[PDB]
Design a protein around this ligand. Structure first.
Ligand SMILES: O=c1ccn([C@@H]2O[C@H](COP(=O)(O)OP(=O)(O)O)[C@@H](O)[C@H]2O)c(=O)[nH]1
Lengths: 619, 6
């Protein structure tokens, strides 16, 4: 007994047998949609399996991926199977999961299907696929052109054939939470250079896969290119165009309302609950802001009691519809005549990116929940701690550089308190922890760990505690890692917080990934009395590491400028057992964790009152 | 729960 019929692999297979293509696509989209809802878990997908796999999860998942891969092959190879444009649009949204069905199976990708679509026996390479001239075959091709594809595609040839298929595939290929393999990371690298100029040409999202737009926006921060955020400017323009075309008018600002003493600051949240990254970093500054401003929180039911409680009042957004949510936010700002709009995170919800492309308050502000520029006209100011900033040029907006201690962090609700420190005196093997999300893995980081293992005078074993490595994601991620580090690495799936600390607690040191580094991952490090190396760079998402290490009295040599620098320091920390133990005794004996939880939260509320006053001077 | 898309 359960809310709703599960998607069935058997239902899917029966449909392909009777050649009921529309039932078959429906069952397939039902299965991918459910996986997408569960971030890769296959609980509540229906399939029979050999009893030997009852108790072996990783092997069950591979069986599932192979059986789905076999079924999708029988379907998409049938030339009698015509795919509608609506079919294709729905598949482009969930290509990330198609990628995993094949990538987590033994088959790696869908290139064997694509080869059946080649009509030119006289072709130079097996990597060149020549298509019959018709829309049907081109959409089947683009849907099955996955991140791990080894088949040639030229974006200029694709663009000139159908802009909408080409645009959709570029969205689909930026959408995965893991894009770390050479094939996937290099498709995405190329897209980020080529696509922004093509995406500007679009007036609406109506013909693109819109429900992965926020993914396109967030995920570009994880490339290495200096100009990697450009796609966000392009996208900001299309969202703006789309929004106006839905009959959106900006708020005409004409009255600053006061509630109790103060003016009103409306706060729009994506994720906010006592164990979420965003509450740990940004809750303290929002509490203290409540002395200068009256605080209205807007959020979904996901936000817990402790999250609602940091606001004078709080309202649930009633549903998923974006136009209704921006209508509710205008009503709120029009009725309270709001002075400031604050989003501590922008980019994790599509609603919040729409909000950053419209006018609701004269002063509109973001923090760095997600540490990237927005390239938006409608955002005046970015809140950020002084020691976190690299170049001011990385940001299209004006920086409000608050003093080092302006955002005192907070422990997770799930944090332990009785933590036994372990300092292994001379370990035979130095266990090296990587606390990272699948987003932060890339060929550069894994080449680097490979080179570290090859030069280290001591045996090293890497332990990856992998956020977002769930269900059908994990086999693919595991093989990516093994392809660089063989038996010298272990890929731990996404685990509950207590279990994730047990994995790190087992380690002797840690390495922060790059280009995009850790924050909450560094609190996790010092929570266990661990030390580690990190890289620094111009972007905030490169510099936070440098900042937090300095806030701990840790030395400059733990912070690298270049990759080669990183490799020397990583080795140094792994070889010199006595030195690393020193650094760990420092962080422990000087309660380093307690110093990250401490500071003056008030400077956000004062600096934003200050800016309203200056604005009010000039009406 | 950490920093990723819905
Ligand atoms: O297996 C995992 C991996 C991650 N996390 C949580 O995710 C947080 C940080 O993830 P995020 O992507 O926000 O990293 P940050 O860049 O903020 O360090 C950790 O502190 C944990 O609370 C977890 O609970 N289990």
């Amino acid at each position: 007994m359960s809310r709703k019929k599960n998607p069935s692999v058997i239902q899917f297979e029966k449909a392909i047998t009777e050649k009921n293509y529309e039932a078959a696509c429906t069952e397939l989209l039902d299965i991918l949609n459910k996986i997408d809802t569960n971030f890769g878990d296959i609980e509540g997908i229906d399939f029979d399996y050999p009893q030997q796999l009852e108790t072996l999860m990783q092997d069950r998942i591979v069986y599932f991926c192979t059986r789905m891969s076999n079924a999708i092959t029988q379907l998409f190879c049938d030339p009698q199977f015509s795919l509608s444009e609506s079919g294709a649009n729905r598949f482009f949204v969930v290509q990330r999961w198609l990628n995993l069905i094949f990538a987590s199976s033994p088959y790696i990708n869908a290139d064997h299907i694509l080869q059946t679509y080649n009509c030119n026996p006289e072709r130079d390479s097996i990597y060149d696929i020549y298509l019959e001239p018709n829309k049907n075959v081109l959409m089947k091709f683009a849907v099955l052109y996955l991140p791990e594809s080894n088949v040639n595609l030229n974006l200029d040839t694709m663009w000139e054939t159908d802009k909408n298929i080409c645009g959709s595939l570029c969205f689909a290929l930026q959408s995965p939470r893991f894009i770390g393999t050479p094939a996937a990371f290099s498709k995405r690298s190329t897209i980020l250079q080529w696509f922004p100029a093509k995406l500007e040409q679009f007036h609406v999202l109506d013909d693109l896969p819109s429900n992965i737009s926020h993914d396109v926006y967030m995920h570009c921060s994880y490339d290495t290119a200096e100009n990697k955020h450009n796609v966000k400017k392009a996208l900001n323009q299309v969202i703006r165009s789309h929004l106006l075309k839905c009959g959106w008018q900006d708020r005409q600002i004409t009255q600053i309302g006061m509630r109790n003493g103060k003016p009103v600051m409306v706060v729009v949240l994506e994720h906010f609950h006592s164990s979420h990254s965003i509450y740990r970093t940004h809750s303290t500054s929002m509490i203290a802001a409540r002395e200068q401003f009256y605080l209205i929180g807007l959020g979904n039911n996901a936000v817990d009691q402790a999250g609602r409680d940091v606001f004078d009042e709080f309202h649930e957004f009633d549903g998923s519809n974006i136009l209704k949510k921006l209508a509710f936010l205008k009503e709120m700002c029009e009725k309270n005549d709001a002075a400031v709009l604050y989003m501590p995170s922008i980019g994790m919800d599509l609603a919040t990116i729409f909000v950053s492309n419209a006018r609701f308050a004269p002063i509109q502000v973001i923090a760095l929940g997600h540490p990237a520029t927005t390239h938006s006209e409608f955002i005046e100011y970015v809140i950020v701690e002084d020691d976190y900033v690299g170049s001011e040029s990385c940001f299209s907006e004006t920086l409000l550089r608050l003093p080092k201690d302006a955002l005192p962090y907070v422990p997770s609700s799930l944090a332990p308190t009785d933590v036994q420190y372990v300092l292994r005196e001379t370990p035979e093997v130095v266990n090296i922890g990587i606390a990272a999300t699948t987003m932060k893995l890339n060929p550069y980081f894994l080449e680097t760990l490979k080179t570290i293992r090859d030069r280290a005078k001591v045996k090293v074993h890497f332990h990856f505690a992998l956020g977002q490595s769930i269900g059908i994601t994990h086999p693919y991620v595991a093989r990516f890692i093994r392809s660089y580090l063989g038996d010298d690495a272990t890929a731990h799936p996404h685990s509950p917080y207590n279990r994730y600390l047990d994995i790190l607690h087992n380690c002797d040191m840690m390495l922060n990934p790059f280009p995009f580094g850790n924050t909450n991952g560094i609190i996790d490090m010092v929570t266990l009395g661990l030390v580690g190396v990190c890289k620094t760079g111009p972007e905030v998402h490169e510099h936070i590491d440098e900042g937090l290490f300095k806030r701990l009295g840790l030395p400059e040599w733990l912070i690298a400028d270049s990759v080669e620098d990183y490799i020397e320091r990583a080795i140094r920390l792994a070889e010199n057992h006595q030195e690393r133990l020193a650094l760990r005794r420092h962080i422990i004996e000087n309660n380093g964790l307690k110093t990250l939880f401490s500071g003056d939260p008030s400077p956000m509320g004062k600096t934003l009152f200050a800016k309203l006053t200056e604005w009010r001077q000039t009406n | 729960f950490g920093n990723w898309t819905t």
